[PDB]
């Protein structure tokens, strides 16, 4: 419906510029007529999820690369894609004028945008907040009588989640994660630094912390929001480190295991929120498979754990078979779910590199690796940041796919936004990853899935500077003859019957 | 009645620790017979507004510096002393338990505290707000039917003010200042950045803005609050600087003049709040004499201006004589008032330094200089901040006399608080600055005033490391022999008959 | 002449991109024919010192703004224009490939560039150094036996200065300033923080320090480099402030006075380098006229002082007449010289803002202001910086007219470069400022000078958005009919016979 | 012989203060009769390589953890331990007065110190250099006639290396790594950033690069220095990261393979320095086993490779078993060597922390892990750094075992330094690692080795806060009853015959 307005800031590619009256969008989604394929294309030269259609042909000859769909090699089913409603993201989007906010929420949540169906909601404050608070800052308040949501929740976060869900046709899943407990529950009595819960699992500190999860859920339910899942703690391993600079709460894998079996599991079960799922870990994938073994080989903790949540800082490089693979082999029936990714910890590069196609490729390459290793969903960090990559109370800034320029009442959709959307738009909940065999080694990243309805979706990333001719075989329909240009990403869609 | 409990944070002096059940306080004011003085003393070494008495004797044993009171040499009368009830300050005070809230408010407003009689109230949001916002965010409501107070006003600020004035013996004067207008009244359509009101004084926008002041004053009146005065805009020169980060609204001196002439003055006059004073500038003193010349050398703007509000922030750029001194000479009948009497801090320093005696010595030095250059009143910035100098939705650069640690239900009284109190507690409204002649060049800062009742008040600041032997002469009573210790501030008080 | 290659980075204007093979340049300078004027134009829209020529008319009618030259009202003679060869500057330039370096040095020092004839040299380390050092770091070395220049001088700074002088057709004048003494000459024993020279003027500390100036001079002399002037100390006021974060040495005006009278004056006088001039102050003009009074009303110190060096941080708009004016009036025979200026506090935006036209206008506006107040010279801070605005060992980054991108082997010439060039290219040493009378009130900044050969030069800056038609009147020749477009800068040059 | 002089800087432990006349040292090694052990102990509490002796008894009086020496399971033989003589380290050493220089050099290199036997020597500049430079910076010297060593080599590094080897008992092995080639060999003509060599293995550029290694070695031989080994490139994977800030030269594993195969190997073989060993990777352990699989499964490449060099950056991203363990299995005859066995510093901590015991433990823990995974040698990063972690021409990022204060002619020996000496002092070249079996799960890190003379060394690290009672059995001699105190590291030494 509306094309990208490109703007350069001197990096490898362009941003798309949005304001109160204009934002790039899509027409309502239609399926390609049987015997044809749809293609979406984003490129470094500046194409943005641009649509074409082509023929599915009956024959193929040649010694070029062929990707062959294996429709009966069925893997993980998809939960979905989204990002986080942090204090910072909330503050930024509401600093835009009301029509700009709506254009921004449409970009992510609407069918005319990229169909996000996950929103991660911090339980009180994190580094991406402009102050440090909890829901229970009255010292020693074991009954949680002074539990309340600050304006950050009731003025900024909640209203925006309501608006986001309104704009979405897909059911949206809310995920919650706490960074810290009240300081009076903690051995070190602070929001940061080294420290865990006081006492032993089973006891008043552990029981009050469990109950705070339930109060959180109650108070969001008062505002007509329900959660799909909660995590046991954001980055439990961070509060094990002396001088950790922002909000944290340390657990060893053993302490997490015991908290869940002794406190958190039974407490959620006994509540009216018992259908909310629980996810362990919520941390670096390098901590796998050990964390999962400690927790899940204890049937008392296992009964209560729906899934394993993993983080990744994309500026680094951890292998995936060692961690996601082994974890899946050890516990095939416990879902693997990526709850946070970000880039921009890059030290020679600033926090926000406006228009960076490299950071775009980092994202889609990470999504593909995750889908290739059983991961069922993928969640970005902050939904929106400023040109500095904040606000952040500890100046630990990072990139975000949307950047808000408040003085200009404009936002910028970076290549990260489009590289995310090549998945989120075309891979609905229930999509099932299926096999796809390459006929010769190549430099391309590829993944195939089938929608609930039975149709095919393939994403292909080209992180090289050379164009790659390739054909995709679907034995039900024929061949799609295409080229993957260097520095492009494609989504291919077709009906199979 | 209760002494300071000292705590060191590794800076040059101490804070006084207060909590829900304890805070340092004063006995009611009780002053002695003719021929005796009262001294209140604060030292870097740890004394905090400590009281003693001594004689005023017929003969002179001092051979060093002599300050002679000259009651017949009469200057300006004093409006008073206070600070700002910003969203930040209100949120911080209200994060304490009720009894703690009361000790903090008594610390400022009661006679058992330091006797504040002025409160500055922002009109909607500033940087010291957790969110951007105005009282009229619905676009094109030129009649402001949609005008209202959010929760920041009706929940935080308004009851805290009601409680401030219950606690106070002296009448409290309220002062309002806007930071930004609704953004649909603005050129740049943004809450911050370079931009002014749309079009020309007299037009549809300039008139709606003027009516906004009336709507603000009305809304506070429904809540039983009356204002002493308003500023025409907070820091109007700021919103002429491209992408200024905070809520701003740009006026040139000429634009301010015409808005007052054509719109603000005429509208306020035609209202039921015609008694509310109008203050121009509200900005760095470096902009004087010029700003005053532009606005006040126009009879139709000048007839509407009671005063000139000034900020201390950038005092070091332009000196007192050339700015305040010169302005008074040209416009001797328009009062000078320090409306945002606040600090720096320093590029290489933290916003909040707990126990910084320097930051205190800066406060008193600056109040003295002001007093010596015709200034009638002083309004500090935020009443309280958190230990990070927040919350500020942009970035915190400033300290505050009271720092709240919400996690501990404790608040800290900085040296700045006592430095302020050496003036505010003992210079009531209507006190007149009188002469005080040094006999020889010296390093003290000193100022003398006479209370409405005729009794003498003298402040001696020793910003140096060395004890200074001092005599104070009153022609009518005799000689007060004393010592001004290095890094001390003293207030002397005595009956004159 | 090779024209500018424009690039945007999202700011108000473009930069000019240079590399190993291409840099925008000028043709050799030509006098315009008698009866015609030369114009050089730079605009926000993207013109960079474009040459045009027009006619000098015999008469004029209007109404319009008329700037009238007063050839016989003669003011200050110009010393010149240039910038600082810091460690940061030099490390950056030498990180370019040999051919790129030369294009950068040509830009500044060549007649085919912008004609710089000042280079300010730090005497050892400053904040724009990647380590701290002095030339005499052996403790208690009073004889200065281990005085030596490091590679920072011998490998980076010196060879670049040689190459700059080689490229220049004009005589270049070198100006040296120290930030710190050896730590064993200081009271606090550190390169930074609050502290002065130990002992009293006249003693071994003060003598050794004076002899260090001579040793510096000797060492630069062995490398065939001769100095025009030395400052008594960079920002003497800075060493008076506890916690001052980088290299400093504190002098009160009195200590500076006496150091000069007792030590630095006689020592330089007794040396072979007695022809090198001594400039006092080297700090902000807010310190004036007081510093000058204190130093210069002492004939023992006055006899040794050739000039007053002044700094301005351009983000702090503060006047002007009260400092530079009052100073010239008191000491008409002691030149004022601007020895350092920089932009980039704007805490709302970066150190570096690639393509900022605003920062360009701050430079030229400050040069006009200076020139209209008797100032004979203007020196920029760092010649070149990286995109972060360093390196700087204390992260005190600022903007620079040339920015080096080392990974690209490219340098960007910001609008600050050209805004400076409108002066340095066209006002040689010896030029005399003359009168220029505006016929009516106007928003333009303007300044007229006469070249040593009798020809005129006028710079006109338009900082408003509106085009201003205007005529320049010279009695010798007639009228120049022209327009000043909004956000533009022009230099006009004509022969007067 | 001389004890540690301790100084605290507010971190968890102390540094040992050394100056021109005083440094801690050891007595000449002296080992007791069969049945007696020697123990060196360092504690966070303050003990530094403190010596005591004790018996090896017939009866077992302990009932806790038992460690049994298994001299018959024999593993890798040890090459040695050392650090890098960077420009920065040479800087930093040479700013000290000669006597102080020598005490620093004995600290590392003599038997009265910690007996270093490896130095890593960068080939031209790296980040720890005060300028960028290579040895052939004049373009189109394809035959390298203008190849020369600058002053950093001939003035700083080489004389220091000479002096190190005079001081050393043991033969010292020199290891050379290039960071960057001449820029006119690089795709990008920049010293840093994304860029590899130009063209293809075999061509003019690759042949010149390879001859550069021979000219480098040639030049060092005229200075009477010869090398043990070179690495093919320092950190090749970083030259693939866009805008990489440090000196670099990108190689994919396939490219390194081909450059070793076609150029580097053949060229070194044909030369007079054919006995110089060649190590591959020189990069993070996460890159393994893959990197190794690419280069070593090609007999044209592998006939030319002696070892695999790894960095400890970046170790947290990958575990030992999966990388080092798995690489040993696949290629059991290619030795693993830690070439840059250094930090790195947590995003929120300073580069240098004086007295950080935790950083010390990080070192010894990591040397232990390495030894338990077949690693034969170590090179720490910079030998010395200034208290800022410099000079680094890009960014001060890491700590160094010795920190040098040039202002005070004093140097500080950090905990890291004694943790290193617990190994380097007592593990001579040719020591072979042996079995050391734990009787039960425990928390100590322990490794046993056999000297070339068949005597025993065991290092025990206790990273916990609690004392652990410990017995060590040697089947041949008996039982050593001991305690590993919390936060301690022990070295045990005994004859077995
Ligand atoms: C925003 O939208 C489009 C951008 O292409 C443009 O035509 C319009 O001028 C812009 N509007 C504002 C309010 O800046
Ligand atoms: C409040 O302060 C008083 C005076 O220091 C003290 O006795 C009391 O313990 C404090 N309250 C708490 C809960 O610490
Ligand atoms: C340098 O810039 C010129 C002019 O824009 C361009 O044509 C040339 O290719 C550039 N060279 C390099 C090495 O980037
Ligand atoms: C060197 O150190 C020793 C022992 O700490 C000390 O006695 C001596 O004063 C030191 N030398 C100097 C110049 O301080």
Instruction: Specify whether the CB–CB gap between D260 and D280 falls below 8 A.
Output: yes
Q: Which ligand is nearest to the CA of B24?
A: 2
Q: Over the Cα atoms of chain B, what is R_g? A: 23
Distance from CA of D132 to the nearest CA of A (A): 17
> Residue B265: exposed, middle, or buried by beta-carbon count in 10 A (0-12, 13-18, 19+)?
buried
A318/D318 touch (CB, cutoff 8 Å), yes or no: yes
| Lookup: tokens for A264 | 């958190």
Between positions 339 and 378 of A, the ones with CB within 8 A of C are 354
Q: In this complex, which of D188, D394, D407 lies closest to C137 when CB atoms are compared?
A: D407
Alpha helices in D124-248 (DSSP H): 151, 158-167, 204-222
Dihedral Cα B66, B71, B73, B75, nearest 10 deg: 110
Given phi > 0 = left and psi -120 to 50 = alpha, else beta, which region is A389?
Answer: left
Q: From the CB of residue A195, how many other CB atoms can be counted at a distance below 10 Å? A: 23
Strands A402-405 and B50-55 come out as unpaired
Residues 6+ apart with CB under 8 A from D258: D200, D201, D202, D301
- SS3 at position C104: helix
- SS3 at position A224: coil
Atom of ligand 2 nearest to the CA of B5: 5
Angle, in degrees to the nearest 10, between helices C415-424 and C357-371: 30
D19, D25, D96: which to mutate for ligand 4, most atoms within 8 A of CB?
Answer: D19
* CA–CA dist D467, D459 (Å, integer): 16
Q: In this complex, which of B130, B190, B408 lies closest to A409 when CB atoms are compared?
A: B190
* CA–CA dist C78, C363 (Å, integer): 17
Strands A65-77 and A456-462 come out as unpaired
* CA–CA dist C82, C167 (Å, integer): 14
Angle, CA D180 vertex, CA D179 and CA D186 arms, to 5° = 150
- SS3 at position A330: helix
The finding on whether B22 has its CB within 6 A of some atom of ligand 2 is yes
- SS3 at position D82: strand
- SS3 at position C198: coil
A9/C7 touch (CB, cutoff 8 Å), yes or no: no
| Lookup: tokens for A287 | 């901590």
What length is written for chain A?
Answer: 497
The finding on whether D22 has its CB within 6 A of some atom of ligand 4 is yes
* CA–CA dist D126, B418 (Å, integer): 55
Nearest to B439 by CA among B406, B461, B472, B482: B472
DSSP state of A338: E
* CA–CA dist C399, C390 (Å, integer): 9
* CA–CA dist D444, D422 (Å, integer): 15
Nearest to D468 by CA among D437, D441, D433, D436: D441
- SS3 at position C269: helix
Distance from CA of B137 to the nearest CA of C (A): 24
C22, C25, C97, C412: which to mutate for ligand 3, most atoms within 8 A of CB?
Answer: C22
* CA–CA dist C453, D276 (Å, integer): 70
Using a CB-CB distance cutoff of 8 angstroms, which residues of chain D are in contact with residue A286?
316-319
Query: Would an 8 Å CB–CB cutoff place D395 in contact with chain A?
Result: yes
Provide the resolution (angstroms). 2.2
* CA–CA dist A352, A349 (Å, integer): 8
Residues 6+ apart with CB under 8 A from A107: A18, A23, A25, A113, A114, A402, A413, A417
| Farthest CA pair distance, chain B | 75
Instruction: Specify whether the CB–CB gap between C329 and C73 falls below 8 A.
Output: no
Q: In this complex, which of C97, C132, C393 lies closest to D189 when CB atoms are compared?
A: C97
Q: Give residues (CB < 6 A) around ligand 3.
A: C 5, 19-22
Nearest to B186 by CA among D386, A97, A277: A97
Residues 6+ apart with CB under 8 A from B203: none
Measure C406 CA to ligand 3 centroid, in angstroms: 15
Nearest to A395 by CA among C181, B270, D348, B207: D348
DSSP state of D125: -
DSSP state of A475: T
Q: Atom 3, ligand 3: which residue's CA is nearest? A: C22
**Tokens 């200024």 sit at which residue?**
B244
Distance from CA of B319 to the nearest CA of C (A): 8
Measure A184 CA to ligand 2 centroid, in angstroms: 16
Strands B65-77 and B50-55 come out as unpaired
Using a CB-CB distance cutoff of 8 angstroms, which residues of chain A are in contact with residue C8?
8-10
Q: From the CB of residue A229, how many other CB atoms can be counted at a distance below 10 Å? A: 23
* CA–CA dist C279, C335 (Å, integer): 9
Among D317, D357, D398, the strongest candidate for a mutation testing the A interface, having the largest count of A CBs within 10 A, is D317
Q: Over the Cα atoms of chain C, what is R_g? A: 23
Strands C15-18 and C6-7 come out as antiparallel
Instruction: Specify whether the CB–CB gap between B22 and B2 falls below 8 A.
Output: yes
* CA–CA dist D119, D227 (Å, integer): 10
Give, for A174, the enclosing helix (H) or strand (E): strand A173-178
| Lookup: tokens for A133 | 């608070």
Sheet strands side by side (includes B478-484):
B50-55, B36-43, B488-494, B456-462, B445-450, B432-438, B65-77, B468-474, B478-484
Q: CA neighbours within 13 Å on the CB side: how many for B481?
A: 9
C7/A7 touch (CB, cutoff 8 Å), yes or no: no
Instruction: Specify whether the CB–CB gap between D380 and D370 falls below 8 A.
Output: no
* CA–CA dist D90, D86 (Å, integer): 6
Q: Atom 14, ligand 4: which residue's CA is nearest? A: D19
The finding on whether B5 has its CB within 6 A of some atom of ligand 2 is yes
Instruction: Specify whether the CB–CB gap between C304 and C213 falls below 8 A.
Output: no
Using a CB-CB distance cutoff of 8 angstroms, which residues of chain A are in contact with residue B151?
151, 155
Give, for A87, the enclosing helix (H) or strand (E): helix A87-93
Dihedral sign for Cα C235, C239, C245, C248, please: positive
Query: Would an 8 Å CB–CB cutoff place C131 in contact with chain D?
Result: yes
DSSP state of C274: T
Structural domains of chain A ordered from first start: 5-30+78-431 (3.20.20.80), 35-77+432-497 (2.60.40.1180)
Given phi > 0 = left and psi -120 to 50 = alpha, else beta, which region is C47?
Answer: beta
Q: In this complex, which of B95, B191, B194 lies closest to A137 when CB atoms are compared?
A: B95
Give, for D492, the enclosing helix (H) or strand (E): strand D488-494
> Residue D280: exposed, middle, or buried by beta-carbon count in 10 A (0-12, 13-18, 19+)?
buried
Nearest to B84 by CA among B127, B134, B22: B127
Nearest to B37 by CA among B27, B49, B51, B58: B51
* CA–CA dist D228, D174 (Å, integer): 5
* CA–CA dist D104, D98 (Å, integer): 10
B230 - beta bridge partners? B176, B278
Angle, CA C196 vertex, CA C194 and CA C202 arms, to 5° = 170
Instruction: Specify whether the CB–CB gap between A334 and A307 falls below 8 A.
Output: yes
CA A494, chain centre distance (Å) = 26
Measure A404 CA to ligand 1 centroid, in angstroms: 15
Q: From the CB of residue C433, how many other CB atoms can be counted at a distance below 10 Å? A: 23
Measure D194 CA to ligand 3 centroid, in angstroms: 18
Per DSSP, which regions of C208-352 are E strands?
229-231, 277-284, 307-313, 335-342
Strands C488-494 and C36-43 come out as antiparallel
| Lookup: tokens for D91 | 């800087």
* CA–CA dist C229, C226 (Å, integer): 9
C neighbour chains, 3+ CB pairs within 8 Å = A, B, D
B neighbour chains, 3+ CB pairs within 8 Å = A, C
- SS3 at position D175: strand
Instruction: Specify whether the CB–CB gap between A256 and A236 falls below 8 A.
Output: yes
Q: From the CB of residue D440, how many other CB atoms can be counted at a distance below 10 Å? A: 7
Residues 6+ apart with CB under 8 A from C496: C71, C450, C454, C455, C456, C474, C476, C477
Chain breaks in chain D following residues, C–N > 2.5 Å: none
C91/D193 touch (CB, cutoff 8 Å), yes or no: no
Q: Give the chain C residue nearest D194 (alpha carbons).
A: C407
Q: CA neighbours within 13 Å on the CB side: how many for B271?
A: 21
DSSP state of C272: T
Q: State residue C71 phi and psi, 5-degree precision.
A: -50, -30
Angle, in degrees to the nearest 10, between helices D357-371 and D415-424: 30
Three-state helix/strand/coil letters over chain B: CECCCEECCCCCCCEEEECCCCCCECCCCCCCCCCEEEEEEEECCCCCCEEEEEECECCCCCCCEEEEEEEEEEEEECCEEEEECCHHHHHHHCCCCHHHHHHHHHHHHCCCCCCCCEEEEEECCCCCCCCCCCCCCCCCCCCCCCCCCCHHHHHHHHHHHHHHHHHCCCCCEEEEEECCCCHHHECCCCCCCCCCECCCCCCHHHHHHHHHHHHHHHHHHHCCCCCCEEECCCCCCHHHCCCCCCCCCCCCHHHHHHHHHHHHHHHHHCCCCCCCEEEEEEEEHHHCCHHHHHHHCCHHHHCCCCEEEEECCCCCCCCHHHHHHHHHHHCCCCEEEEEEECCCCCCCCCCCCCCCHHHHHHHHHHHHHHHHCCEEEEEEEECCECCCCCCCCCCCCCCCCEEEEHHHCEEEECHHHHHHHHHHCCCCCCCEEEEEEECCCCCCEEEEEECCCCCEEEEEEECCCCCEEEEEEECCCEEEEEEECCCEEEEEEECCC
How far from A20 is each of A9, A93, A102, A112, B150, CA to CA, in Å? 21, 12, 8, 16, 24
The experimental technique behind this entry is: X-ray
Distance from CA of C9 to the nearest CA of A (A): 4
Given phi > 0 = left and psi -120 to 50 = alpha, else beta, which region is B432?
Answer: beta
Q: CA neighbours within 13 Å on the CB side: how many for A454?
A: 6
How far from D244 is each of C389, D127, D195, D239, CA to CA, in Å? 17, 11, 9, 7
Nearest to C399 by CA among C407, C390, C408: C390
Q: Going by beta carbons, is chain D in contact with chain B, meaning 3 or more pairs sit under 8 Å apart?
A: no
Nearest to A287 by CA among A262, A258, A253: A253
> Residue D386: exposed, middle, or buried by beta-carbon count in 10 A (0-12, 13-18, 19+)?
buried
> Residue D72: exposed, middle, or buried by beta-carbon count in 10 A (0-12, 13-18, 19+)?
exposed
Q: Give the chain A residue nearest B138 (alpha carbons).
A: A98
DSSP per residue over C443-457, as a string?
Answer: SEEEEEEE-TTS-EE
How far from B443 is each of B49, B65, B470, B487, C252, CA to CA, in Å? 22, 10, 11, 12, 15
How far from D120 is each of C287, C474, D84, D230, D323, CA to CA, in Å? 53, 72, 4, 9, 23
Using a CB-CB distance cutoff of 8 angstroms, which residues of chain D are in contact with residue C195?
none
Between positions 169 and 208 of A, the ones with CB within 8 A of B are 182-184, 189-191
* CA–CA dist A456, B349 (Å, integer): 59
Dihedral Cα A98, A102, A107, A112, nearest 10 deg: -150
Dihedral sign for Cα D107, D110, D116, D122, please: positive
Q: Atom 2, ligand 2: which residue's CA is nearest? A: B22
Nearest to B156 by CA among B226, B87, B98: B87
- SS3 at position D224: coil
Residues 6+ apart with CB under 8 A from D308: D279, D280, D281, D288, D291, D292, D327, D331, D334, D335, D336, D337
Query: Would an 8 Å CB–CB cutoff place D245 in contact with chain A?
Result: yes
Instruction: Specify whether the CB–CB gap between C39 and C51 falls below 8 A.
Output: yes
Instruction: Specify whether the CB–CB gap between A458 and A448 falls below 8 A.
Output: yes
Instruction: Specify whether the CB–CB gap between D338 and D344 falls below 8 A.
Output: no
Q: Atom 5, ligand 1: which residue's CA is nearest? A: A5
Nearest to C41 by CA among C52, C30, C33: C52
> Residue C333: exposed, middle, or buried by beta-carbon count in 10 A (0-12, 13-18, 19+)?
exposed
Q: Over the Cα atoms of chain D, what is R_g? A: 23
Q: State residue D454 phi and psi, 5-degree precision.
A: 85, 10
- SS3 at position C479: strand
The finding on whether D8 has its CB within 6 A of some atom of ligand 4 is no
Q: State residue B355 phi and psi, 5-degree precision.
A: 100, 15
> Residue C143: exposed, middle, or buried by beta-carbon count in 10 A (0-12, 13-18, 19+)?
exposed
Task: Give yes or no: B235 in active site.
Answer: yes
| Lookup: tokens for D362 | 């990080």
Chain breaks in chain A following residues, C–N > 2.5 Å: none
The finding on whether A21 has its CB within 6 A of some atom of ligand 1 is yes
Angle, CA C376 vertex, CA C374 and CA C381 arms, to 5° = 120
Q: State residue C254 phi and psi, 5-degree precision.
A: -65, -45
Q: From the CB of residue D332, how many other CB atoms can be counted at a distance below 10 Å? A: 9
């Amino acid at each position: 419906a509306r094309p990208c307005i490109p703007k350069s800031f001197g990096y490898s590619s362009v941003v798309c510029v949005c304001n109160a009256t204009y934002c790039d969008s899509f027409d309502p989604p239609t399926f390609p007529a049987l015997g044809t394929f749809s293609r979406y294309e984003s490129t470094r030269s500046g194409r943005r999820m641009e649509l074409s259609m082509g023929p599915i042909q009956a024959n193929h000859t040649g010694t070029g690369l062929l990707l062959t769909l294996q429709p009966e090699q069925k893997f993980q089913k998809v939960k979905g894609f989204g990002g986080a409603m942090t204090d910072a993201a909330a503050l930024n989007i509401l600093a835009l004028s009301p029509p700009a906010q709506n254009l921004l929420l449409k970009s992510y949540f609407s069918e005319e945008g990229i169909g996000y169906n996950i929103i991660r909601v911090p339980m009180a404050s994190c580094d991406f907040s402009i102050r440090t608070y909890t829901y229970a800052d009255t010292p020693d308040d074991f009954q949680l009588h002074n539990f309340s949501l600050p304006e950050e929740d009731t003025k900024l976060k909640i209203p925006l989640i309501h608006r986001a869900l309104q704009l979405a046709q897909r059911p949206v899943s809310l995920l919650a994660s706490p960074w810290t407990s009240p300081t009076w529950l903690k051995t070190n009595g602070a929001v940061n630094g080294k420290g865990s819960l006081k006492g032993q699992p089973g006891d008043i500190y552990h029981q009050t912390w469990a109950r705070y999860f339930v109060k959180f859920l109650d108070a969001y339910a008062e505002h007509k929001l329900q959660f799909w899942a909660v995590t046991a703690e954001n980055e439990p391993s961070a509060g094990l480190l002396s001088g950790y600079p922002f909000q944290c709460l340390g657990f060893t894998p053993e302490h997490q295991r015991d908290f869940i079996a002794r406190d958190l599991g039974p407490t959620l079960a006994n509540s009216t929120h018992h259908n909310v799922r629980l996810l362990m870990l919520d941390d670096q994938r390098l901590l796998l498979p050990h964390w999962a073994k400690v927790v899940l080989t204890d049937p008392e903790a296992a009964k209560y754990v729906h899934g394993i949540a993993v983080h990744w800082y994309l500026d680094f490089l951890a292998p995936a078979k060692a961690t996601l693979g082994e974890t899946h082999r050890l516990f095939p029936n416990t879902m693997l779910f990526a709850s946070e990714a970000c880039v921009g910890s890059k030290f020679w590069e600033q926090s926000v590199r406006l228009g960076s196609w490299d950071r775009g490729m980092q994202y889609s390459h990470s999504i593909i690796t995750n889908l290739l290793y059983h991961v069922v969903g993928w969640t970005d960090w902050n939904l929106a940041l400023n040109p500095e990559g904040g606000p952040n109370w500890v100046r630990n800034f990072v990139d975000s796919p949307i950047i808000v320029d408040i003085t200009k009442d404009t936002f910028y959709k970076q290549p990260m936004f489009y590289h995310l959307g090549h998945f989120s738009k075309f891979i609905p909940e229930g999509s099932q990853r299926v096999g796809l065999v390459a006929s010769q080694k190549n430099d391309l990243d590829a993944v195939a899935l089938m929608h609930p309805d039975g149709s095919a979706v393939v994403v292909v990333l080209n992180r090289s500077s050379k164009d790659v001719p390739l054909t995709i075989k679907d034995p039900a329909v024929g061949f799609l003859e295409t080229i993957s240009p260097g520095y492009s990403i494609h989504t291919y869609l077709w009906h199979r019957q």
